């Protein structure tokens, strides 16, 4: 199985320095171009750069966009890719991915990392509120959430059950408002098996390494 | 440099009909080394990473549908899918290998249903936020189609809004809508009825979901 794992995105105020690493298994790594390649929120894929493989001399490239701020390198002996950027700005504000790229035959990306988000900016970091969303006084199924308020930087994870209930989840894009992002997830289950069984939403916030069970408890 | 177009920005489509969406590049991508076109396809579905899906223009990767076909050389090139599913639901993207790397802008994909209307939930501020002074009021609206809803917010019957919407559902196909409206807490505590209404076109009624204060 292949596996390619993002680390090191968050919060950095412009003017600042970041070196993100992507962890690599299940394929000869040294047989392989690696890529990088961002996407700012809700906009498209951007190529940053790549470092060749081994027969290639593991030289880097670079878009125009980049060239000269940015630096990608690999360690051979542990499989990892890394890149450096420097003097980051707001634009720099993207999920970054790493991709396995050329291996001197075919054409293609044919895996991709889960990304990892970098926010820039001078704003602290917060840790959410998280609110139980119970019924009020008000059937045959029961909706209920949770409230993440007034956290910053993005991302947060939103799970049920610790993801045992996955089916009939909606989670609510985060919306910032002064200053501050603010999300929402439902969880709709038979009304048989709430309060009867436990429902408890999982929220983590990695910038302040929250992390939060929020039991729903009836009213 | 490689400029890479794609067309169109935004499509809807109903499950089981043809899609089709097109990519142009700046230059040919014809490799006269090898003679194949360095295009490759991805799908991006919502909230997960970008996945391979055709490359060399035509060459569709082990794993994906025979629905999916790439084709065109040189400077134009088509995505064509068949019998398309609510799970292809993404945005596409083109990209050229033949200098560097280069991605077209995407085409994103949604899919058209049957109307639908939502489900509706208040719900009331919970006590570990009033204790800190605020007082936010919860209304989701789930499960409906179009994306057009309209929610208003009534206290004490009379007329601080978050409104978030979901990307479309990949297994049904709708939309779902969550309305924040956040008070203090001595400003919630002057009222007693707080009523969310939502009006989508699949009724002329609005559909009203309300509690009072003095029922919690
Ligand atoms: C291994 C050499 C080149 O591969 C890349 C590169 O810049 O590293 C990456 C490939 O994905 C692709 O863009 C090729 C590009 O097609 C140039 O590759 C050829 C060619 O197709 O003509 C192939 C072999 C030799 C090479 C140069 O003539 C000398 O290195 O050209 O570039
Ligand atoms: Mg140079
Ligand atoms: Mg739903
Ligand atoms: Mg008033
Ligand atoms: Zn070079
Ligand atoms: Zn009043």
């Known amino acids: 199985e292949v596996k390619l794992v993002e680390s090191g995105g968050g919060l950095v105020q412009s003017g600042g320095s970041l070196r993100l690493s992507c962890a690599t298994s299940g394929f000869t790594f040294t047989d392989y171009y690696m890529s990088w390649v961002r996407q700012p929120p809700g906009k498209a894929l951007e190529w940053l750069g790549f470092?060749?493989?081994?027969?290639?001399?593991?030289?880097?490239e670079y878009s125009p966009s980049v060239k000269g701020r940015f630096t990608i390198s690999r360690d051979n002996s542990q499989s990892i890719l890394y890149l450096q950027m420097n003097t980051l700005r707001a634009e720099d504000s993207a999920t970054y991915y790493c991709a396995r790229d050329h291996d001197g035959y075919y054409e293609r990306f044919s895996y991709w990392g889960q990304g990892t988000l970098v926010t820039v900016s001078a704003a602290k970091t917060t840790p959410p509120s998280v609110y139980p969303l119970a019924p009020g006084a008000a059937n045959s199924m029961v909706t209920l959430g949770c409230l993440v308020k007034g956290y910053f930087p993005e991302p947060v994870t939103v799970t049920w059950n610790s993801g045992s209930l996955s089916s009939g989840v909606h989670t609510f894009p985060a919306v910032l408002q002064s200053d501050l992002y603010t999300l929402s997830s439902s969880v709709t289950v038979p009304s048989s098996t709430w309060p009867s069984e436990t429902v408890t939403c999982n929220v983590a916030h990695p910038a302040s390494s929250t992390k939060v069970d929020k039991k729903i408890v009836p009213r | 440099d490689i400029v890479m177009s794609q067309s169109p920005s935004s499509l809807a489509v109903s499950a089981g009909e043809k899609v089709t969406m097109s990519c142009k590049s700046s230059?040919?991508?014809?490799?006269?080394?090898?003679?194949?076109?360095?295009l490759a396809w991805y799908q991006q579905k919502p909230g997960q990473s970008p996945k391979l899906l055709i490359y060399?223009?035509?060459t569709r990767e082990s794993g994906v549908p025979d629905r999916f076909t790439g084709s065109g050389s040189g400077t134009d090139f088509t995505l064509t899918i068949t019998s398309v599913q609510a799970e292809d639901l993404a945005v596409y993207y083109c990209?050229?290998?033949?200098?560097?790397?280069?991605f077209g802008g995407g085409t994103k994909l949604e899919i058209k249903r049957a109307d639908a209307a939502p489900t509706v939930s208040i719900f009331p501020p919970s006590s570990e936020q009033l204790t800190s002074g605020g007082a936010s009021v919860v209304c989701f609206l789930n499960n409906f189609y179009p994306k057009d809803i309209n929610v208003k917010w009534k206290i004490d019957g009379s007329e601080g809004v978050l409104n978030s919407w979901t990307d479309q559902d990949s297994k049904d196909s709708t939309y779902s809508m969550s309305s924040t409206l956040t008070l203090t807490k001595d400003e919630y505590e002057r009222h007693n009825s707080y009523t969310c209404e939502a009006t989508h076109k699949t009724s002329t009624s609005p559909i009203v979901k309300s509690f009072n204060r003095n029922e919690c």
């Open positions: 470092i060749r493989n081994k027969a290639n001399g593991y030289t880097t």
């Open positions: 230059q040919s991508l014809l490799n006269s080394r090898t003679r194949k076109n360095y």
């Open positions: 990209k050229q290998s033949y200098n560097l790397r280069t």
């Open positions: 060399w223009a035509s």
